[PDB]
């Protein structure tokens, strides 16, 4: 025997010292294992969706900064932002999962969590769908973050989580459009994300505003069906016109509450045309497929390495 054969693969070698900052290269089986770990973590759909959104939603198309790479949600100041309060209570579990595994960055794991969330919400609505996921993100550390000569702004508003920091007479609807264009979303993709994320229970503070469904955590088209249902009549609750009550016209009962961010989807002609497609009988699969595309789009905004 002359030993001139192919080099045994690195996956077969018994031992190799841990790098103090490992390069990761998760295998398909690595990703599958992480998925099961996340699904069995006891994190809810809403939390899985929340933590994923919070990490990714900082992207600015204007200059191409922000997004889920680097995992700044785990660092200051993002970890402490009011709007991220719900998201951040899920981090410690992914942090532990990341350590036990050592197969992927925390940056990747955060987005994987969103993938698992959307998949579960989909099966709860009677659909098996594959949510695309690309590994490769890295974790930034606190100092690397502190030195950077660009600035990411704590958001005055994020309509996708029905968050509005203070009223200053810039309208909530225009602030939602601003966020959306920062993320380079089209009007249809913005529309699927809002409706999706509403019924998923992704409001920053657990409020029921715009949550037009009795089955939270299920990726249905409930939001759209109930928003366009003429059975309901919509009234402002006071002079601000920031908050609305939807009452059954047949029985008088107050069924829903809503903010301006929710109501605009039925109160602008273009958005409404989109909403009425998603409301359609038998448009559920189509909605789910547009929500997924939109969601994955947002999750990948900053992935210039996937050149």
Looking up tokens 């031992």, which residue turns up?
15
Look up the CATH number of the domain holding residue 305. Answer: 1.10.520.10
Residues 27 and 97 in one domain: yes
Instruction: Give which of 34, 46, 190 is closest to 118, Cα–Cα.
Output: 46
Backbone angles phi and psi of 28, in degrees to 5: -50, -40
Smallest CA-to-CA distance from 228 within 191, 186, 253 is with 191
- For residue 248, give the 3-state DSSP assignment: strand
Are residues 66 and 177 both part of a single domain? no
Domain carrying residue 259: 155-282
Q: Are 173 and 195 within one domain?
A: yes
Residues 256, 212 contacting (CB under 8 angstroms): yes
For residues 16 and 36, membership in a common domain is answered with yes
Structure-determination technique: X-ray
Q: Cα angle vertex 137, ends 136, 142, to 5°? A: 150
Q: How far is CA 62 from CA 152, 181, 186, in A?
A: 12, 9, 15
Residues 22 and 135 reside in one and the same domain: yes
Q: Could you tell me if residue 148 is left (phi over 0), alpha (psi between -120 and 50 degrees) or otherwise beta?
A: beta
Radius of gyration of the chain (CA): 21
174 and 29 both lie in a single domain = no
- Say how far apart CA 86 and CA 57 lie, in whole Å: 14
Q: Is-cis flag, bond preceding 77, omega within 30? A: yes
Q: In whole angstroms, what is the distance from residue 57 CA to residue 76 CA?
A: 16
Where do we find the tokens 């273009």? 270
Question: Which one, of 161, 166, 188, 154, lies nearest residue 176 by Cα?
Answer: 161
Handedness of CA 216, 233, 277, 273 (dihedral sign): negative
C-beta of residue 293 within 8 angstroms of C-beta of residue 280? no
Q: Which of 116, 111, 106 is nearest to 134 (CA)?
A: 111
Verify that 77 and 147 share a domain, yes or no.
yes
Strand partners, 87: none
Start-to-end C-alpha separation, the chain: 45
| Cα angle, residue 296 at apex, residues 295 and 298 outer, rounded to 5° | 65
Angle of the 28-39 helix axis to the 91-101 helix axis, nearest 10? 140
CB 67 within 8 A of CB 302: yes
Beta bridge partners, 258, equal: 244
Contact 46, 54 (CB under 8 A): no
Closest CA to 50 of 196, 166, 220: 196
The token pair that represents 104 in the structure block: 């992927």
**Is residue 253 classed exposed, middle or buried when 0-12, 13-18 and 19+ CB atoms within 10 A define those classes?**
exposed
Residues 58, 85 within the same domain: yes
Q: 249 and 179, same structural domain?
A: yes
- Which tokens sit at 87? 């998201």
- CA 112/CA 31 separation, integer angstroms: 8
d(CA 291, CA 298): 11
Same domain, 98 and 9: yes
How many other C-beta atoms are found inside a 10 Å radius of the C-beta of residue 277?
17
Query: Other C-beta atoms within 10 Å of 107: how many?
Result: 25
Give the C-alpha separation, 90 to 98, whole Å. Answer: 13
* Resolution of the coordinates, Å: 2.3
- Claim to verify: residue 243 and residue 289 sit in the same structural domain: no
CB contact at 8 A, 169 and 284: no
**Total number of domains in the chain:** 2
Q: Residues 74, 90: one domain?
A: yes
Measure the CA–CA gap between 210 and 194, rounded to whole angstroms.
9
What residues are paired with 256 via a beta bridge? 246
Q: How long, in residues, is the chain? A: 307
What is the maximal distance between C-alpha atoms in the chain? 89
Helix, strand or coil, per DSSP, at residue 255:
strand
User: Could you give the residue ranges of the DSSP H alpha helices within the chain?
Assistant: 28-39, 45-56, 85-88, 91-101, 106-124, 142-146, 172-182, 187-200, 222-228, 260-263, 269-279, 284-299
Residues 6 or more apart whose CB falls under 8 angstroms from that of 8 comprise none
Chain CA centroid to CA 55, Å: 8
């Amino acid at each position: 025997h002359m030993y001139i054969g192919p080099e045994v693969p690195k996956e077969d070698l018994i031992w190799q010292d841990p790098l103090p900052q490992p390069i990761y290269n998760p295998t398909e089986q690595d990703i599958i294992d992480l998925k099961f770990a996340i699904a069995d973590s006891g994190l809810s759909v809403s939390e899985l969706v929340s933590v994923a959104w919070a990490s990714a939603s900082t992207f600015r198309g204007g200059d191409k900064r922000g997004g889920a790479n680097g995992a700044r949600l785990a660092l200051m100041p993002q970890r402490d932002w009011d709007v991220n309060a719900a998201a951040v209570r899920a981090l410690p579990v992914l942090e532990k999962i990341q350590k036990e595994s050592g197969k992927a960055s925390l940056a990747d794991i955060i987005v994987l969590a969103g993938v698992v969330g959307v998949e579960k919400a989909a099966s709860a609505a009677g659909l098996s769908i594959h949510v695309p996921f690309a590994p490769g993100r890295v974790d930034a550390r606190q100092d690397q973050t502190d030195i950077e000569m660009f600035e990411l702004l704590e958001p005055i508003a994020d309509g996708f989580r029905n968050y509005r920091a203070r009223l200053d007479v810039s309208t909530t609807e225009s602030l939602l459009i601003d966020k959306a264009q920062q993320l380079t979303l089209t009007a249809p993709e913005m529309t699927a994300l809002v409706g999706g994320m509403r019924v998923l229970g992704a409001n920053f503070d657990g409020s029921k505003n715009g949550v037009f469904t009795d089955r939270v955590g299920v990726l249905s088209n409930d939001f759209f069906v109930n928003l366009l249902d003429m059975r309901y009549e919509w009234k402002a609750t006071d002079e601000s016109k920031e908050l609305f009550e939807g009452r059954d016209r047949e029985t008088g009962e107050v069924k829903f509450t809503a903010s301006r961010a929710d109501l605009v989807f039925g109160s602008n002609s273009v958005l409404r045309a989109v909403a009425e497609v998603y409301a359609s009988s038998d448009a559920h699969e189509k909605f789910v497929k547009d929500f997924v595309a939109a969601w994955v789009k947002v999750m990948n905004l900053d992935r210039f390495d996937l050149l």
